[PDB]
């Protein structure tokens, strides 16, 4: 798995590869690892497929019930609910989750939640097995307040490299754009991103 | 008849007489008020000096919930404390799960549902307090008042206890004469005046004034007690207006 | 915040009466008429759709309920009590039978389970009895067609034909004259419509009458093909049009 | 006479506590109405703010239960809020367990089953409320389902609740007798709201300002309440024809 | 086991081989692995045989009660949600690996679910020991906008690949077709490419060949009258 | 250590023309030590026959359990349980001990009294059903029984022919297993008569 | 609180009686009569149905006579639904005993257990008692043929012949008059039907009004057979004895 | 009348009669006085005997080194509540290494008493308490009533004829508050205060019970010949 979320001028963009593995067999080559927990709060999933689905389903439930009572939850609140589940059930879970969302007040925000269940607010985040190969690249090429086109290219080039070197990552590059304008889904096929 | 002997029994009217009897305990208590201002809220209460032996400024009645919500009540004082203790548990579990401090409307319903639950069974007694509470959240200032039935609404100004009619009249004048709004420092002065004017209903024993406030500009959106020079300035303003 | 009612609310009075059961039976008497008739090749159950308002959509309120594919139920008395009993009856058919034996219970044993639930509301702590009488019609392989009545006490009896609720005394007399052991299902439907017309005041048509049968297997209603042994539900609710057709030959 | 204090049968086969809960329903002295369009379901209710010290924005008897389901209550606000919180929790739990949005009629059934339990179990009192649930259901289309303290529920072409319910009911009955259809044949929800307000004005015989009404609208995939200014726009259009 | 699912124009088809094993021995040559959850929701099972049966029957029972409660025809997403939460709770110990398909008022659907409780969406899927052989065929011949006839053909070919090349799979091909606006058609033993040849010899014995010590009638009847 | 092979033993069942046969060996041991030569493994509840191999304490426990359940069934239903229904009851009862199972290999055999149809079934220890047309095998010599049955069996055998086939399948399978044998019993079951035969076999 | 509405079902009166037990017995006195008669070669159970309607399906009906196991049966007087709760418990107890000891339960042990359950409802739990009286007819290899009765108090006693339900005073006088120790089953059948025929509140005793059963050690080769009589078989025995 | 059967029932004028009846048990109890200065806090208690052969019932209970109370009413209820205070003082020490504030001790007693007034089955506490202590904000005196109401005071008295001592303290307020660094003079003022509530009987050696806590003084109880000095 290779996943990332990147804040930019107009909001935040989430990105992921589409590979699911059983040993060295690719169980699913067109996986969707970008999952909606609220209208404009999404997450990138890595680790156990079962665990991250179970967690994400519970978080979606908690935020739906939050919305009914208190109105739209903040991205920080969504991250806190993820954290609570990951921290308290750390002994029984294998989940590495990036939470990304758009408010009008706070604009684009990214929170990363690694294995222990700690929370870390960051301008961008990378995770999954394939992320190890792009720490160097991402640190050198990330700038704050990038444009939409620049941020799409940054994620496309980054995950392209993660896919190239990690056997556990591959397939298509899926992205989800979160701005005031709404929610846009993007897809990029091997013939496009391999030749970069 | 017999419909008033047990809590949660509907009378033929469709009324719960035990709740209406709890309201009488509230009406018997000392006067307490709330004033919504431009960027916050002000709370004030009448403390009856039963004896010279009471230590001044020590028997504090107004209570804080979390760091941003103030609570005051009239009626059975222990019932009010029980409700605030629950309010503190509700605010803590909200902050634990969701990170952000509990919004005031959210907090209002937590108290409301808990008070309402004490009208559902004969094994419990209704609350013998009406509670005025509020503070500052992300959406601004909010003032609420909650009755023994579990009923609550938002308010521009609120009052309960023995001097409530007197206080309600004074609050209604402020709403008419200040449509653009009232400042936080103004609301403290006016709160002192209203408690002093409402004291004519409890005029036998002399009393002690106690004020608190939350304001975005004056207290950084945190609940604080009015103390020292600012308290004395409000007492002097109140003493001048009655004379 | 405690349930302190751990004691019986139904007790014996000096005369030997269980008051709450009698009073529940009185609530059943006030309820709308429903009936059941058993034929040689089927069973019919029927009742009036007493609409509380003409703005209300009476199609949404189902007085006649499927319990299993071969068992159906109708009532007289308190509608909400009936609705929760239908929920519990459907569930107990699975939990205490289908999940053990891999097949639906026979009519008499499902009746027995419903009866048990109603008995318990007549003895357990802090509850009143159910304010309904049920008529349960069904089929199973070894007992054939059957029709049962269940009362607030938990008592149940098998019937060739009967009626319960408002005009049950008159309706039972009407059925005694018309019923014989050589009736076909169509004859029983005809007799059910005649009997029910006497207890209805206002409009009498497919939209104000609710009628269902336990009859032949309906493979067209099954929803799938490929298993010869699964031949379809014997329970079928008659449509508004199907009722009106038989009212012309009445 | 302890058969009138708890939910056990009287000698007549009656539950007096259920009947008295029905009377608590009208304690607020508010009338509500619900109608169905082609693409929508509209619910209107009277709004009365007697005290000048009240914040009028917080005074409401319409609740957003889920994204698709709205609920208007006739009855005291504590019991209304009790019912609202439970319905919200039940709607969310349903989505989590079964993977799709709780239908309006199913939520109505669930809340009615809970109300039934309070009529059978002694330690719990009935809630003194009538709950009118509205949505545009993805299978059944525009939907109105109403629950009461007896645990009774049914679907409706249109409905009305409150002290003057019968006057509203007959007004609506007479309209549907003319048109010979189960709904308001109208494309936009705006005109269906205008119909609802107009027929309440005719039935009650009172005029309404922007602050005297409260409106809820269900469309496909959302339920929302109108602001005072949105209602004013509705009132202007009624007056101009 | 080899099980597959394939989406088409107006529905979805599932298929399975008919072999069940106990160690290296074939326990049943004509096993039925296509389980009906509800009339139009069916699923193919692989893994621990008792677990797949128990899990389909439990969720099928609760789906039936849910359908009666809501007055609505059951949805595939509901069967999926109930199956995954049950399997997650048991942390993989319930060894059920399933392909869940069906038609409902929302449309046609195809999912897979694994024993630990993860699910996936796809136009074509395979599970069991023969899933690699089946997926090879699916990855070579699948296209968008398949007809009913093309999808049945592709699904059975994918099972055949499992039958011939995987020692875990064998015998016959079972198919179930679920088309929108139609009854689901279960095709038991849709292909039979593994009939045993006639034996060379008859092994019927002469009567009296086996040595007997004692004979007796067994009373199977109840206690008699008179 | 392995509970399924402490005591030893086998059961086999076969269908014929308007008949079924079920058979078992008589050995009970503690690994190498032969203890009993009278330990029968076939029981009956009305007209439904149940054979059970595996851990002997569980064989006895499950016999007593299904006697209990089929007695209550009969009182409530007012009829004897049928083979198809009993099969489901066995499966339900085994699977409820999913994570602490009975270490057994049950085999159901009988004729449905209404349809007259011959019926056999087998199960694993957690209750999975194998409903075979031809034959069912169980026990420590199951491999051996599978081989014998798969070669010796032909469909539609008359009762007296089916006796010879099932007996030879059992005997020759038992003689290739250390923990089976020590005697054998064969039930021939027809719609309204059941014959039980003890077989002469080698006593080692 | 809830104390206000508690009837207090498990208290003594000033005279030392259990109110609810006494009132339950009053309920049972209105139920249809059931008679048990024990002979040297068998037991008879006869009972009168309460709800005469021509439209009642009799051949599939069971309100009075229930089977507990192959050796033991009961006749019911009182609330049928209450009785069925107890019957199913007794059926389970019998099978628990069979599972444990591999022997059919002795009659007294089953009777004691059910009677202890009834007793419990009179001493604790605050619930109403079961409004049921049973006649137990059974056989075991210790005492042979046995008749018992139990009532809502949980007290049980053994009998040569006994009645429960309606008109027991009248019924017990008639049985005490005509019963003898050397009596046989065929004679006991006649006595049971003659006693019901005189005590009945109905105009005449007919086949559609009766449930009838026998427990004989007159089965093939010294076993015990429970015969629950069919409607036609009750009609035949009514003609044979000379009542219709 | 009809509204006094249990603690869960309000009367039509909003009163809780069971709580008021519990309050009555305090008035029947023997007199006890509390007072304080800035440095010290004193309890004085008139102990009651059953007859001349009996002992005099102990009125004062130690809760911690820096806190204790005197009782009036049902003594077993004072034992339950003082045990609770002992535990809460102890919890504060073990978990936070912190001597429990006297004001916070009062809040805990209030909330414990309250729960018994709102739930069915239970009864209110039938005792009143005077808690003295010295903490980080100096000397303190509290009055506890079993309604839940707890009050901080310079001085007070509870029990039979307690109004006499309470009036004296109301006059003496300005004098005794200034008795700093002089424990014997503060006790004298307490003994003179309790004397205003006496009729017929006078203060003997085994009748009187005194306790004191202060700046460099642990909570200590004086009985017997230790109080002969003050008679
Ligand atoms: C590809 C990636 C970089 O790992 C990325 O994180 C993705 C993200 C998902 C799609 C959200 N993760 C996977 O693909 C996981 C990787 C993983 C494997 C094992 C433990 C943790 C993570 N793959 C799965 O979760 C896989 C999905 C199935 C195929 C639908 N599940 C398994 O492989 C299953 C997990 C068991 C498990 C669960 C939790 C902790 C530890 C173990 N494992 C097996 O089935 C093992 N397999 C081994 C080979 O023989 C067959 C059995
Ligand atoms: C065959 C296949 C290609 O793998 C395909 O997935 C099928 C699909 C089924 C029919 C839906 N799977 C099987 O046939 C399984 C394969 C399997 C075996 C063992 C573990 C997991 C999977 N077969 C069975 O489940 C088999 C069915 C019987 C033959 C009817 N059962 C067993 O082999 C049984 C499993 C026991 C078990 C217990 C706990 C956890 C998991 C499994 N094992 C035995 O019977 C072994 N032994 C027990 C003691 O007596 C002697 C035999
Ligand atoms: Cl429900
Ligand atoms: Mg790669
Ligand atoms: Mg109730
Ligand atoms: Mg051997
Ligand atoms: Mg040997």
Q: Which fold has domain H1-231?
A: 3.60.20
Q: Chains G/A: 3 or more C-beta pairs closer than 8 A?
A: no
Which residue of A57, A68, A69 is in closest CB contact with D96? Answer: A57
Ligand 1 pocket check for A92: Cβ under 6 Å: no
Are E226 and G220 contacting, i.e. CB atoms less than 8 angstroms apart?
Answer: yes
Residues of B in contact with C1 (CB under 8 A): 117, 121, 123-124
User: Ligand 2, atom 21: nearest CA belongs to which residue?
Assistant: E48
Nearest ligand to the CA of F144 is: 6
Please answer yes or no on whether F195 and E50 come within 8 Å at the CB atom.
no
Element of type H or E holding A77: helix A75-88
Q: Can you list the domains of chain C with their CATH numbers?
A: 1-250 (3.60.20.10)
CA of D63 from ligand 5 middle (Å) equals 26
Q: Residue H219 — φ and ψ, nearest 5°? A: -65, 110
> What DSSP designation does G63 have?
S
Domain residues for the domain of F91 are 1-204
Angle of the C168-178 helix axis to the C185-199 helix axis, nearest 10: 150
Domain residues for the domain of B123 are 1-243
Nearest CA in chain C to F114: C142
Residues 6+ positions from H121 with CB-CB distance below 8 Å: B123, C4, G1
| In the block, residue with structure tokens 């012949």 | G161
> What DSSP designation does B199 have?
G
The two structure tokens encoding residue D232: 């004013």
Per DSSP (E only), the strands in chain F are 10-16, 19-25, 28-30, 33-36, 42-45, 48-54, 104-111, 118-123, 129-130, 135-139, 184-190, 193-199
D189: three-class secondary structure by DSSP: helix
Method: X-ray
How far apart are the C-alpha atoms of B103 and A77, rounded to whole Å? 13
* Ligand 2 atom nearest residue E22's Cα: 33
Cβ under 8 Å to C: E residues 181-210: 183-188
Q: Residue B27 — φ and ψ, nearest 5°? A: -60, -30
Torsion of CA F26, F30, F33, F39, to 10 degrees: -20
User: CB distance from G143 to chain E under 8 Å?
Assistant: no
Count other Cβ atoms within 10 Å, centred on residue D239: 8
User: CB distance from E63 to chain D under 8 Å?
Assistant: no
Per-residue buried b or exposed e for B29-66, using 16+ beta carbons within 10 Å of the residue's own CB: bbbbbbbbbbbbbbbbbbbbeebebbeeeebebbbbbb
Per-residue buried b or exposed e for D22-59, using 16+ beta carbons within 10 Å of the residue's own CB: bbbbbbbebbbbbbbbebbbbbbbbbeeebebbbeebb
Domain ranges of chain E: 1-226
Question: Cα separations (Å) of B131 from B31, B40, G187, H37?
Answer: 11, 18, 85, 36
Alpha helices in chain E (DSSP H): 49-70, 76-89, 131-141, 148-165
CA-nearest of H167, H161, H156, H163 to H201 is H161
Are A75 and A106 contacting, i.e. CB atoms less than 8 angstroms apart?
Answer: yes
The two structure tokens encoding residue C130: 């159910």
Are E175 and E14 contacting, i.e. CB atoms less than 8 angstroms apart?
Answer: yes
CA-nearest of E99, A60, C12 to G29 is C12
Residues 6+ positions from A135 with CB-CB distance below 8 Å: A126
Report the domain count for chain F: 1
Cβ under 8 Å to D: C residues 102-131: 121, 126-131
Ligand 1 pocket check for A158: Cβ under 6 Å: no
> Which of C14, C15, C16 to probe the G interface (max G CBs under 10 A)?
C16
Q: Chains D/F: 3 or more C-beta pairs closer than 8 A?
A: no
What's the N-to-C CA distance of chain F in angstroms? 23
> Which of E91, E203, E223 to probe the F interface (max F CBs under 10 A)?
E203
Per-residue buried b or exposed e for G11-26, using 16+ beta carbons within 10 Å of the residue's own CB: eeeeeeebbbbebbbb
Question: Cα separations (Å) of F17 from B60, C44, C180, F154?
Answer: 96, 42, 44, 11
Query: What are the beta bridge partners of residue B70?
Result: B64, B134
Residues 6+ positions from H95 with CB-CB distance below 8 Å: none
Which among A14, A46, A48, A169 is the best mutation to test ligand 1's pocket, defined by most ligand atoms within 8 Å of the CB?
Answer: A48
* Shortest alpha-carbon distance between residue G26 and chain D (Å): 21
G140: three-class secondary structure by DSSP: strand
User: CB distance from F89 to chain E under 8 Å?
Assistant: no
* Ligand 1 atom nearest residue A45's Cα: 11
Class of the CATH domain delimited by E1-226: alpha beta
Q: Chains H/D: 3 or more C-beta pairs closer than 8 A?
A: no
* Shortest alpha-carbon distance between residue E173 and chain D (Å): 32
Of the candidates E1, E2, E18, E56, the residue annotated as catalytic is E1
Which among A4, A18, A21 is the best mutation to test ligand 1's pocket, defined by most ligand atoms within 8 Å of the CB?
Answer: A21
Q: Can you list the domains of chain D with their CATH numbers?
A: 1-241 (3.60.20.10)
CATH number at residue B94: 3.60.20.10
Angle of the E148-165 helix axis to the E131-141 helix axis, nearest 10: 140
Domain ranges of chain H: 1-231
CATH number at residue A159: 3.60.20.10
* Ligand 1 atom nearest residue E118's Cα: 30
Are F183 and F27 contacting, i.e. CB atoms less than 8 angstroms apart?
Answer: yes
CA-nearest of H156, H150, H187, H152 to H170 is H156
Ligand 2 pocket check for E46: Cβ under 6 Å: yes
User: CB distance from D109 to chain E under 8 Å?
Assistant: yes
| In the block, residue with structure tokens 């979320």 | A5
Element of type H or E holding H142: strand H138-144
The resolution, in Å, is 2.3
G24: three-class secondary structure by DSSP: helix
Nearest CA in chain A to D68: A68
Please answer yes or no on whether G69 and F64 come within 8 Å at the CB atom.
no
How far apart are the C-alpha atoms of C145 and C71, rounded to whole Å? 10
Nearest ligand to the CA of D18 is: 5
Are D159 and D175 contacting, i.e. CB atoms less than 8 angstroms apart?
Answer: no
Nearest CA in chain G to H119: G1
| In the block, residue with structure tokens 């009686």 | G17
How far apart are the C-alpha atoms of B129 and B81, rounded to whole Å? 10
Are B70 and B62 contacting, i.e. CB atoms less than 8 angstroms apart?
Answer: yes
Domain residues for the domain of A107 are 1-196
| In the block, residue with structure tokens 């509608």 | C79
* Shortest alpha-carbon distance between residue H56 and chain B (Å): 30
What's the N-to-C CA distance of chain B in angstroms? 51
What's the N-to-C CA distance of chain H in angstroms? 46
Query: What are the beta bridge partners of residue B36?
Result: B41
Ligand 1 pocket check for E7: Cβ under 6 Å: no
How far apart are the C-alpha atoms of H139 and H154, rounded to whole Å? 9
Count other Cβ atoms within 10 Å, centred on residue A67: 18
How far apart are the C-alpha atoms of A117 and A123, rounded to whole Å? 19
Question: Cα separations (Å) of G101 from F57, F59, G97, G106?
Answer: 16, 17, 6, 11
* Shortest alpha-carbon distance between residue F196 and chain E (Å): 6
How far apart are the C-alpha atoms of H182 and H187, rounded to whole Å? 9
Alpha helices in F78-141 (DSSP H): 83-95
Strand-strand pairing, E3-8 and G225-228 = unpaired
CATH number at residue F124: 3.60.20.10
User: CB distance from B23 to chain H under 8 Å?
Assistant: yes
Report the domain count for chain B: 1
Q: Is A1 designated active site? A: yes
* Ligand 1 atom nearest residue A19's Cα: 1
CB-proximal residues (5 Å) to ion ligand 6: F 180-181
Residues of B in contact with A76 (CB under 8 A): 99-100
């Amino acid at each position: 798995t290779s996943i990332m979320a990147v804040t930019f001028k107009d909001g935040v963009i989430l990105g992921a590869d589409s590979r699911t593995t059983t040993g060295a067999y690719i169980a699913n080559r067109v996986t969707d690892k970008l999952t909606r927990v609220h209208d404009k709060i999404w997450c990138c999933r890595s680790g156990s497929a079962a665990d991250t689905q179970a967690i994400a389903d519970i978080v979606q439930y908690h935020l739906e019930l939050y919305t009914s009572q208190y109105g739209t939850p903040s991205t920080e609140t969504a991250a806190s609910v993820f954290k609570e589940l990951c921290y308290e059930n750390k002994d029984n879970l294998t989940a590495g989750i990036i939470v990304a969302g758009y408010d009008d007040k706070n604009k684009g925000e990214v929170y990363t939640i690694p294995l222990g269940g700690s929370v870390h607010k960051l301008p961008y985040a990378i995770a999954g097995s394939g992320s190890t190969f792009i720490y160097g690249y991402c640190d050198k090429n990330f700038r704050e307040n990038m444009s939409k086109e620049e941020t799409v290219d940054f994620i496309k080039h980054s995950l392209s490299q993660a896919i190239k070197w990690d056997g556990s990552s591959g397939g298509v590059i899926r992205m989800v754009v979160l701005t005031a304008a709404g929610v846009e889904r993007l897809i990029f096929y091997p013939d496009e991103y391999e030749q970069l | 008849t017999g419909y008033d002997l047990s809590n949660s029994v509907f009378s033929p009217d469709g009324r719960n007489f035990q709740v209406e009897y709890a309201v009488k305990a509230v009406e018997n208590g000392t006067t307490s008020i709330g004033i919504k201002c431009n960027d916050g809220v002000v709370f004030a209460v009448e403390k009856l000096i039963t004896s010279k032996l009471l230590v001044p400024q020590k028997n504090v009645k107004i209570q804080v919930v979390d760091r941003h919500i103030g609570c005051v009540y009239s009626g059975l004082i222990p019932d009010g404390r029980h409700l605030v203790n629950r309010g503190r548990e509700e605010a803590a579990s909200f902050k634990k799960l969701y990170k952000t401090p509990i919004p005031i409307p959210a907090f209002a319903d937590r108290l409301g549902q808990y008070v309402q639950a004490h009208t559902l069974y004969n094994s419990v007694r209704p609350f013998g307090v009406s509670t005025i509470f509020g503070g500052v959240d992300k959406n601004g200032a909010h003032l609420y008042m909650l009755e023994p039935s579990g009923s609550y609404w938002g308010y521009k100004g609120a009052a309960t206890g023995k001097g409530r009619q007197s206080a309600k009249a004074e609050l209604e004048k402020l709403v008419d004469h200040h449509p653009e709004g009232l400042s936080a420092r103004e609301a403290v002065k006016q709160a002192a005046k209203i408690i002093y004017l409402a004291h004519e209903d409890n005029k036998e024993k002399d009393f002690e004034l106690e004020i608190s406030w939350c304001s975005l500009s004056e207290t950084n959106g945190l609940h604080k007690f009015v103390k020292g020079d600012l308290l004395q300035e409000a007492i002097d303003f109140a003493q001048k207006e009655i004379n | 915040m405690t349930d302190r009612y751990s004691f019986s609310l139904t007790t014996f009075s000096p005369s030997g009466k269980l008051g709450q059961i009698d009073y529940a039976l009185t609530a059943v008497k006030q309820g709308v008429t429903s009936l059941g008739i058993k034929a040689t090749n089927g069973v019919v159950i029927a009742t009036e759709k007493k609409s509380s308002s003409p703005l209300a959509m009476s199609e949404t309120l189902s007085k006649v309920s499927l319990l299993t594919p071969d068992i159906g139920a109708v009532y007289s008395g308190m509608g909400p009590d009936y609705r929760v009993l239908v929920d519990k009856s459907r569930k107990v058919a699975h939990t205490s039978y289908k999940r053990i034996y891999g097949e639906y219970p026979p009519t008499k044993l499902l009746v027995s389970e419903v009866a048990k639930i109603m008995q318990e509301a007549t003895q357990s702590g802090g509850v009143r009895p159910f304010g309904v009488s049920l008529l349960i019609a069904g089929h199973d392989e070894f007992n054939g067609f059957s029709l049962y009545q269940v009362d607030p006490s938990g008592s149940y009896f098998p019937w060739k034909a009967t009626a319960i609720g408002k005009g049950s005394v008159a309706a039972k007399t009407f059925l005694e004259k018309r019923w014989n052991d050589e009736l076909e299902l169509e004859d029983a439907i005809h007799i059910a419509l005649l009997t029910l017309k006497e207890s209805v005041e206002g409009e009498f048509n497919g939209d104000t009458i609710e009628l269902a049968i336990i009859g032949d297997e309906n493979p067209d209603l099954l929803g799938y093909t490929g298993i010869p042994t699964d031949k379809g539900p014997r329970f079928r609710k008659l449509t508004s049009q199907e009722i009106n057709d038989r009212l012309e030959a009445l | 006479g302890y058969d009138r204090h708890i939910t056990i049968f009287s000698p007549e086969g009656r539950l007096y506590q259920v009947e008295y809960a029905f009377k608590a329903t009208n304690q607020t002295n508010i009338n509500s109405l619900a109608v169905r369009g082609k693409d929508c379901t509209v619910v209107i209710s009277q709004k009365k703010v007697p005290d000048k010290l009240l914040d009028p924005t917080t005074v409401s008897y319409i609740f957003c239960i889920s994204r698709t389901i709205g609920m208007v209550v006739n009855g005291p606000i504590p019991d209304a809020r009790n019912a609202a919180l439970r319905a919200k929790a039940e709607a969310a739990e349903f989505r989590y367990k079964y993977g799709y949005d709780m239908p309006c009629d199913v939520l109505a059934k669930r809340m009615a089953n809970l109300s039934q339990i309070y009529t059978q179990r002694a330690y719990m009192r009935p809630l003194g409320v009538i709950l009118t649930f509205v949505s545009v259901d993805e299978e059944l289309g525009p939907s109105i389902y109403k629950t009461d303290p007896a645990g009774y529920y049914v679907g409706y072409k249109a409905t009305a609740t409150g002290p003057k319910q019968q006057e509203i009911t007959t007004n609506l009955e007479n309209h549907f007798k003319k048109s010979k259809i189960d709904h308001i044949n109208e494309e936009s929800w705006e005109k269906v709201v205008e119909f609802a307000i107009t027929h309440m004005i005719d039935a009650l015989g009172t005029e309404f300002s922007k602050n005297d009404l409260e409106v809820g609208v269900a469309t496909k995939d959302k339920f929302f309440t109108l602001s005072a200014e949105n209602i004013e726009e509705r009132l202007v259009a009624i007056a101009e024809q | 086991t080899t099980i597959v699912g394939v989406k088409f124009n107006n529905g979805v088809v599932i298929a399975a081989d008919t072999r069940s094993t106990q160690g290296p021995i074939v326990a049943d040559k004509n096993c039925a692995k296509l389980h009906r959850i509800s009339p139009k929701i069916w699923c193919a099972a692989a893994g621990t045989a008792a677990d797949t049966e128990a899990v389909t029957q439990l969720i099928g029972s609760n789906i039936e009660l849910h359908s009666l409660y809501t007055s609505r025809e059951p949805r595939v997403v509901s069967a999926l949600q109930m199956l995954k939460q049950h399997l997650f709770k048991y942390q993989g110990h319930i060894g059920a690996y399933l392909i869940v398909a069906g038609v409902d008022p929302t449309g046609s659907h195809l999912f897979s679910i694994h024993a630990h409780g993860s699910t996936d969406v796809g136009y074509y899927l395979s599970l069991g020991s023969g899933s690699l052989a089946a997926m090879a065929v699916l990855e070579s011949h699948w296209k968008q906008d398949l007809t009913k006839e093309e999808a049945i053909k592709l699904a059975s070919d994918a099972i055949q690949a499992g039958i011939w090349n995987d020692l875990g799979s064998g015998s016959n091909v079972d198919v179930c077709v679920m088309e929108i606006g139609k009854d689901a058609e279960y095709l038991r033993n849709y292909l039979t490419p593994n009939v045993r040849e006639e034996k060379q010899k008859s092994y019927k014995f002469p009567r009296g060949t086996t040595a007997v010590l004692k004979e007796s009638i067994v009373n199977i009847c109840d206690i008699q009258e008179e | 250590s392995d509970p399924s092979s402490i005591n030893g033993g086998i059961v086999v069942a076969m269908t014929g023309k308007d008949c079924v046969a079920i058979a078992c060996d008589l050995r009970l041991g503690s690994q190498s030590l032969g203890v009993s030569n009278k330990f029968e493994k076939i029981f009956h509840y009305g007209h439904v026959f149940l054979g059970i191999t595996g851990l002997a304490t569980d064989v006895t426990t499950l016999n007593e359990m299904f006697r209990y359940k089929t007695n209550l069934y009969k009182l409530k239903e007012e009829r004897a349980i049928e083979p198809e229904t009993f099969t489901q009851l066995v499966s339900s009862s085994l699977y409820e001990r999913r994570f602490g199972p009975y270490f057994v290999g049950p085999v159901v055999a009988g004729i449905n009294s209404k349809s007259g149809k011959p019926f056999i079934a087998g199960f694993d220890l957690i209750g999975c059903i194998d409903e075979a047309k031809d034959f069912i095998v169980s026990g420590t010599a199951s491999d051996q029984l599978f081989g014998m049955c798969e070669s010796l069996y032909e469909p539609n055998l008359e009762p007296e022919d089916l006796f010879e086939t099932i007996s030879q399948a059992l005997l020759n399978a038992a003689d290739r297993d250390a923990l089976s044998g020590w005697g054998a019993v064969v039930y021939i079951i027809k719609k309204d008569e059941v014959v039980k035969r003890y077989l002469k076999m080698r006593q080692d | 609180g809830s104390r206000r509405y508690d009837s207090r079902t498990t208290i003594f009166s000033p005279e030392g009686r259990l109110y609810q037990v006494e009132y339950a017995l009053e309920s049972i006195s209105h139920a249809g009569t059931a008679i048990g008669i024990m002979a040297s070669d068998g037991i008879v159970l006869a009972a009168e149905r309460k709800v005469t309607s021509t439209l009642l399906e009799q051949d599939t009906s069971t309100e009075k006579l229930y089977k507990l196991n192959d050796k033991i049966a009961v006749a019911v007087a009182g609330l049928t639904a209450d009785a069925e709760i107890l019957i199913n418990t007794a059926r389970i107890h019998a099978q628990n005993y069979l599972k444990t000891y591999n022997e059919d339960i002795p009659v007294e042990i089953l009777v004691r257990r059910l009677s202890d359950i009834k007793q419990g409802y009179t001493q604790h739990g605050g619930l109403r008692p079961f409004g049921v009286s049973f006649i137990y007819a059974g056989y075991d290899d210790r005492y042979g043929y046995q008749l018992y009765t139990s009532n809502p108090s949980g007290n049980y006693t053994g009998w040569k012949a006994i009645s429960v339900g309606a008109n027991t005073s009248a019924a017990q006088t008639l049985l005490q008059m005509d019963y003898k120790d050397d009596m046989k089953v065929d004679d006991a059948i006649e006595l049971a039907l003659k006693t019901l025929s005189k005590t009945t509140d109905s105009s005449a005793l007919t086949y559609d009004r009766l449930e009838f059963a026998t427990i004989r050690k007159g089965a093939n080769d010294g076993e015990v057979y429970q015969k629950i009589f069919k409607p036609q078989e009750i009609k035949d025995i009514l003609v044979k004895t000379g009542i219709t | 009348n009809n509204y006094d059967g249990d603690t869960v029932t309000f009367s039509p004028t909003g009163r809780l009669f069971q709580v008021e009846y519990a309050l009555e048990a305090i008035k029947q109890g023997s007199v006890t006085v509390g007072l304080r200065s800035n440095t010290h806090a004193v309890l004085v208690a008139l102990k009651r005997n059953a007859d001349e052969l009996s002992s005099y019932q102990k009125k004062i209970i130690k809760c911690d080194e820096h806190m204790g109370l005197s009782l009036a009413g049902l003594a077993p209820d004072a034992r339950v509540l003082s045990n609770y205070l002992r535990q809460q003082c102890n919890y504060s020490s073990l978990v936070f290494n912190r001597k429990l504030a006297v004001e916070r001790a009062g809040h805990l007693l209030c909330d414990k008493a309250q729960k018994n007034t709102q739930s069915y089955g239970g009864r209110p506490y039938g005792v009143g308490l005077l808690i003295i202590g010295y903490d980080k904000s100096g000397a303190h005196l509290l009055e506890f009533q079993p309604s839940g109401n707890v009050t901080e005071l310079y001085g007070t008295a509870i029990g039979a004829r307690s109004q006499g001592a309470k009036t004296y303290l109301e006059r003496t307020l300005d004098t005794f508050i200034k008795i700093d660094g002089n424990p014997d003079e503060l006790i004298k003022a307490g003994v003179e205060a309790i004397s205003q509530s006496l009729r017929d009987e006078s203060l003997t050696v085994d009748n009187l019970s005194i306790a004191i806590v202060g700046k460099d003084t642990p909570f200590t109880i004086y009985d017997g010949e230790a109080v002969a000095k003050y008679i």
